[PDB]
RNA sequence: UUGAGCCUUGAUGUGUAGGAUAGGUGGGAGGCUUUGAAGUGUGGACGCCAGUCUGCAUGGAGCCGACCUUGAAAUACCACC
């Protein structure tokens, strides 16, 4: 529907991303969640991308 | 085509302006010497002149912001002055939103409705009013100041330079809005068609004599 | 006379040889002067780009033929070491505001990183002419004693114009022809060594040794 | 000899111009027009490369010069008139500010040693030693008198303020994204003046003004951005 | 007839402030001039209109340069563009 797909690309430098959905009409700003990066095995920040 | 119309609140009857002698000059030869003036409740008084002769400094001291070496400007008994400055950027600050910024300007209307309609009448969609009022651009900055005088209902108007960023359709709406306006306004515009069609009583500024009045501005140039 | 007779005698349509060029260069002898003859090499770069610029200094085996009044604007121990190198200045701003204000100029500028005084003292007068030694060119270096000897040794400086062509002093007529050839080879090799990395196309196209008061002849 | 490329932008709900795909080049001046509050100013703001779009179609030409007059004609009441014109050269301005922290620095560091030399050699390479004089002749050439060269921009009439801001844009650049709505300078005399300057200059320029007559005399192509 | 590229030569290109319509790099301050000059009158062309400019003999052999306000020096000179 109105909810489209984004990917949260990690900030640890490695290429890893959690893919989710986000409604843009209500909120046009980015998403920032501290998630787990299996490449470096640590909890790092995941800024929205794509 | 935004739909704007200005309506009065008390409608003074005899006259508005009273200027005896202005003699205001910043750091050079004074831009005007005396400028005896009277408005007489109407007389849309298009101030004119080439840029750099001080038509905006005349209006700024005509409203009482810049103190002149004059002897006061003597507004009427119940004048409600509405100002649309040539530069308008101090108003759009402190990161109020579109709905927030518009809301404080009112006297009797309600806060939720009757200000959404006025703000939304001039082409502001539902999702356009939930963003900061400083991020607006150009005509929307101008369109706010037209809406600002909607609810204020200024009995006497100024409109320093109204047709600046408007998109050739708001100009047709603004030209129509001031045409049926009842009351007094003292504007200075630079284009010809806006001044020509809109009612006028010319006061051109050239060094040193300030020529006053020739009628329609279709006759002011015809006299040349 | 000479400027209208050197034109027909020496033709620019044909490209000459190195050995002949030095011989014809001294062949003129029309103008009695020091005649510091020189060469302008058409470097192939895009001077519009800031990464293709060539700006450095090199030393010739025989020298420039003249000692530059290398004032040392390096306050501290550099002045003590540079006092025995033959410098006409000490490390301070004294030779830049009163000495360098009404004074005309020095020959070269020796810089000391420990003193940020002569950097602004020259300003639009001592720097507007380009006399300020670039930090990467060795004019302003961590030390002052080593550079002073090399500066007097004939550390020639070369920069591109707006087009990207380089010409700097190589020697005088008083130097014998064999000396000049080695001096020319010293410039070309260091110029070729310092040629940048984003330099598409052929680098050296035209090389033309010229007289101070005469003409210039193509070499290759 | 180069051209520009495509972009796509959105500041929230209902994205604005949705996969634009255009090219600007040659000598023709694309007059860009559009209704209020729809692309235009922010479309070519993206083109300047200072801010990047959301969908990111990208439009690159990083070799030649871009000079941009903007809509905020009062964005500098502080800088003196000579400083605003010099600041039109972005590389020169940013270099000078970090260079100018010499007399404001009472103590110098070791790493500052060659840093001040590194900035100064860049200053001379792009010949900032004439920027004040180079602008002055140009600034005098657009009609600004000498006596106000060193004065602040706060004390300059807005009609005059466009003549300074156009001189800032004209800094030897073979394209200009002109946000010039000749708002204050509508003397007809000054309007007729600005029509000669742009017409007799060969550049792949863009003009955005709402003046129907002004777009006739100058622009050759139009790039209306109306529906989507 | 008209566009586009290439070679060759010659011309060509200030306000701020001056003796002057000085493009950039600085090698240098002595070249230039009678392989006919200073100034004189005589004609193009160009010209943010003062002037560059070169066919012109006669007149016939001194002009330039350094200095001087300048961000910068100077058709004084040649070359590489
Ligand atoms: N604060 C000030 N200090 C010094 N001079 C000023 C100041 N304000 C205005 N001036 C000068 O006095 C005159 C008044 O110009 P002003 O700013 O009032 O606009 P204006 O002449 O009406 O111009 P426009 O038609 O372009 O809007 C101008 O010549 C301006 O340069
Ligand atoms: N920072 C921002 N983030 C998101 N959306 C924005 C932002 N700034 C502006 N917008 C939106 O983009 C619209 C277009 O603004 P823009 O600056 O492009 O004006 P414009 O259409 O060129 O107007 P004018 O012709 O009056 O200059 C605004 O009305 C606003 O809704
Ligand atoms: Na004004
Ligand atoms: Na805009």
Coordinates of N, CA and C in Angstrom, one line a residue, chain B residues 137-139 164-168, chain D residues 17 24 29-47 68-73 162 166 176-183 194 198 205-216 218-225:
Chain B
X137 N 8.9 28.6 1.0 CA 9.7 29.2 -0.1 C 9.0 30.2 -0.8
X138 N 9.5 31.4 -1.0 CA 9.1 32.4 -2.0 C 7.6 32.9 -1.8
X139 N 6.8 32.4 -2.7 CA 5.4 32.9 -2.7 C 4.7 32.5 -1.5
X164 N 6.1 40.3 -5.5 CA 7.6 40.0 -5.6 C 7.8 38.6 -6.1
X165 N 7.4 37.6 -5.4 CA 7.6 36.2 -5.7 C 6.4 35.5 -6.2
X166 N 5.2 36.2 -6.3 CA 4.0 35.6 -6.7 C 4.1 35.1 -8.1
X167 N 3.3 34.0 -8.5 CA 3.5 33.2 -9.6 C 2.5 33.6 -10.8
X168 N 2.2 34.8 -11.0 CA 1.5 35.4 -12.1 C 0.0 35.0 -12.1
Chain D
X17 N 8.9 16.0 -8.4 CA 9.1 15.9 -9.8 C 9.5 14.5 -10.3
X24 N 21.0 19.7 -20.0 CA 21.2 21.1 -20.3 C 22.6 21.3 -20.8
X29 N 19.6 29.0 -23.5 CA 19.3 29.3 -22.1 C 17.9 28.8 -21.7
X30 N 17.9 27.7 -21.0 CA 16.6 27.0 -20.6 C 15.9 27.9 -19.6
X31 N 14.9 28.6 -20.0 CA 14.1 29.3 -19.0 C 13.2 28.4 -18.2
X32 N 13.5 28.3 -16.9 CA 12.7 27.4 -16.1 C 11.6 28.1 -15.4
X33 N 10.4 27.6 -15.6 CA 9.2 28.3 -15.1 C 8.4 27.2 -14.3
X34 N 7.5 27.7 -13.4 CA 6.7 26.8 -12.7 C 5.8 27.6 -11.7
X35 N 4.8 26.9 -11.2 CA 3.9 27.6 -10.2 C 4.6 27.7 -8.9
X36 N 4.0 28.5 -8.0 CA 4.6 28.7 -6.7 C 4.6 27.4 -5.9
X37 N 5.6 27.2 -5.1 CA 5.8 26.1 -4.3 C 5.8 24.7 -5.0
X38 N 6.6 24.7 -6.1 CA 6.7 23.4 -6.9 C 8.0 23.4 -7.6
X39 N 9.0 22.6 -7.0 CA 10.3 22.5 -7.7 C 11.0 23.8 -7.9
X40 N 11.4 24.0 -9.2 CA 12.1 25.2 -9.6 C 13.3 25.5 -8.7
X41 N 13.1 26.3 -7.7 CA 14.3 26.8 -6.8 C 15.1 25.6 -6.3
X42 N 14.3 24.6 -5.7 CA 15.0 23.4 -5.2 C 15.4 22.4 -6.2
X43 N 14.8 22.5 -7.4 CA 15.3 21.5 -8.5 C 16.7 21.8 -8.9
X44 N 17.0 23.1 -9.2 CA 18.3 23.5 -9.7 C 19.2 23.7 -8.5
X45 N 18.7 23.9 -7.3 CA 19.6 23.8 -6.1 C 20.3 22.5 -6.0
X46 N 19.5 21.4 -6.3 CA 20.1 20.1 -6.5 C 21.2 20.1 -7.6
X47 N 20.8 20.7 -8.7 CA 21.7 20.8 -9.9 C 23.1 21.4 -9.5
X68 N 26.1 30.6 -8.9 CA 24.6 30.6 -8.6 C 24.2 31.8 -7.8
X69 N 23.3 32.5 -8.4 CA 22.5 33.5 -7.7 C 21.3 32.9 -7.1
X70 N 21.0 33.2 -5.9 CA 19.9 32.5 -5.2 C 18.8 33.5 -4.9
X71 N 17.7 33.0 -4.2 CA 16.6 33.9 -3.9 C 16.7 34.7 -2.6
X72 N 17.5 34.2 -1.6 CA 17.7 34.9 -0.4 C 18.6 36.1 -0.7
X73 N 18.0 37.2 -1.1 CA 18.8 38.4 -1.5 C 19.2 39.2 -0.3
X162 N 20.9 43.4 -6.0 CA 20.9 42.4 -7.1 C 22.1 42.7 -8.0
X166 N 24.6 39.7 -8.8 CA 24.9 39.2 -10.1 C 26.4 39.3 -10.5
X176 N 25.4 29.3 -15.4 CA 24.9 30.0 -14.1 C 23.5 29.5 -13.9
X177 N 23.2 29.1 -12.7 CA 21.8 28.7 -12.3 C 21.2 29.9 -11.7
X178 N 20.6 30.8 -12.5 CA 20.1 32.1 -12.1 C 18.7 31.9 -11.4
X179 N 18.6 32.0 -10.1 CA 17.4 32.2 -9.4 C 16.8 33.6 -9.5
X180 N 17.3 34.4 -10.4 CA 17.0 35.8 -10.5 C 15.6 36.0 -10.9
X181 N 14.7 36.1 -9.8 CA 13.5 36.8 -10.0 C 13.8 38.3 -9.9
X182 N 13.8 39.1 -10.9 CA 14.2 40.5 -10.8 C 13.2 41.2 -10.0
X183 N 13.1 40.9 -8.7 CA 12.0 41.4 -7.9 C 12.2 42.9 -7.6
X194 N 19.9 44.4 -17.4 CA 20.2 43.0 -17.2 C 19.8 42.1 -18.4
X198 N 22.9 39.4 -20.0 CA 22.8 38.0 -20.2 C 22.7 37.6 -21.7
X205 N 23.2 28.9 -19.6 CA 22.6 29.4 -18.4 C 21.2 28.9 -18.2
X206 N 20.7 29.1 -17.0 CA 19.3 28.8 -16.7 C 18.7 30.0 -15.9
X207 N 17.5 30.4 -16.3 CA 16.8 31.5 -15.7 C 15.4 31.0 -15.2
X208 N 15.0 31.6 -14.1 CA 13.9 31.0 -13.3 C 12.7 32.0 -13.1
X209 N 12.9 33.3 -13.6 CA 12.0 34.4 -13.2 C 10.6 34.1 -13.7
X210 N 9.6 34.8 -13.0 CA 8.2 34.7 -13.4 C 7.8 35.8 -14.4
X211 N 8.7 36.7 -14.7 CA 8.3 37.8 -15.6 C 8.1 37.2 -17.0
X212 N 6.9 37.3 -17.5 CA 6.6 36.8 -18.9 C 7.4 37.5 -19.9
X213 N 7.5 38.9 -19.8 CA 8.2 39.6 -20.8 C 9.7 39.4 -20.7
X214 N 10.3 39.3 -19.5 CA 11.7 39.1 -19.4 C 12.2 37.8 -20.0
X215 N 11.3 36.8 -19.9 CA 11.7 35.5 -20.4 C 11.7 35.5 -22.0
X216 N 10.9 36.4 -22.6 CA 10.9 36.5 -24.0 C 12.3 37.0 -24.6
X218 N 15.3 37.0 -23.4 CA 16.5 36.3 -23.0 C 16.5 34.8 -23.4
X219 N 15.5 34.1 -22.8 CA 15.5 32.6 -22.9 C 15.1 32.1 -24.3
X220 N 15.7 31.0 -24.7 CA 15.5 30.3 -26.0 C 14.7 29.0 -25.8
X221 N 14.9 28.3 -24.7 CA 14.1 27.1 -24.4 C 13.4 27.3 -23.1
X222 N 12.3 26.5 -22.9 CA 11.6 26.5 -21.7 C 11.4 25.1 -21.1
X223 N 11.5 25.0 -19.8 CA 11.6 23.8 -19.1 C 10.5 23.7 -18.0
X224 N 9.3 24.0 -18.4 CA 8.1 24.0 -17.5 C 8.1 22.8 -16.6
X225 N 7.9 23.0 -15.3 CA 7.8 21.9 -14.3 C 6.4 22.1 -13.6

